[PDB]
């Protein structure tokens, strides 16, 4: 296994950790704030996923400072992970095209 496929795997594992920790911390941050909906773990996890994927339906979102800071970490982890996968795919294709051209 080369570097790019290693970093991609690591980013995927790390993303899973961020989703789980993010769901836990979001509930912890949002409870205590009147009107907050991000307050139970199952839907918090669903919120984490759609935050990391950038979909953001808007059915759930943080209203507190720390809940929003947690969200930012989830967003960045998502953008970085999927960005790291795209870069890895590009490296794979560049290398294969390099061999195909006999260089």
């Amino acid at each position: 296994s080369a570097l790019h496929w290693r970093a991609a795997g690591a980013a995927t594992v790390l993303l899973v950790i961020v989703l789980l920790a993010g769901s836990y911390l979001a509930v912890l941050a949002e409870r205590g704030a009147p009107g907050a909906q991000l307050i139970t773990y199952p839907r918090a996890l669903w919120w984490s996923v759609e935050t990391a994927t950038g979909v953001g339906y808007g059915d759930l979102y943080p209203v507190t400072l720390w809940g929003r800071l947690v969200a930012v970490v989830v967003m960045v982890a998502g953008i970085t992970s999927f960005g790291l996968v795209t870069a890895a795919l590009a490296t794979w294709f560049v290398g294969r095209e390099q061999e195909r051209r006999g260089h």
Partner: antibody
Amino acid sequence: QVQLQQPGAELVKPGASVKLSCKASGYTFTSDWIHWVKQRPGHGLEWIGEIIPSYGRANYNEKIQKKATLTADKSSSTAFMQLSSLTSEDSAVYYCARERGDGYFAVWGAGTTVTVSS
Amino acid sequence: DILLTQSPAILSVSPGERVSFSCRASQSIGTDIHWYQQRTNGSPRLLIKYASESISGIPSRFSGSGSGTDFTLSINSVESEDIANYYCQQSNRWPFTFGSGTKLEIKR
């Protein structure tokens, strides 16, 4: 086995303070919240506050005067509620309940009847 | 905060008859409502979670329905042990809140 164990009763003098206990058993998770509910005779259920033992953070009902302070001990799996400066208005049954972080109170304690009197 | 209205406060029914408790939320809360039973001198007891999901150990005659703002707890053929107070509770928005409660009476 009884998941939540509370003392039967507590007698408190007007102005004094009392710490109610709630010893938990059964399955315990990091996502567990312990809630406290106040019920006056003839009246309904009134939410007081919550605490997450795995982190120690507590939240309280903003609609009522804060006379409670929630703490927890992970070593003995026991939740505590510190009621301070009590009047006859504070005389009620105080239940503790366990929520698995999914919104509902799966199990309740037997309740601690608190009487404020001289 | 979310207000839960339970009306009527008292429901009189004949034995074996179907009864329905109503719970109305001050705003839309999907299906995040839960039902509890409290008999005389007893502690509350979970009957239905998430509006309609049954609980292990609870008789099949207990059921729930509704979504949004209007929720209903139903009892098929009320018997004597069903005499109690019935509370609804929401978990959609912080803080959790309880309804005022409905008492069930049996006309024997």
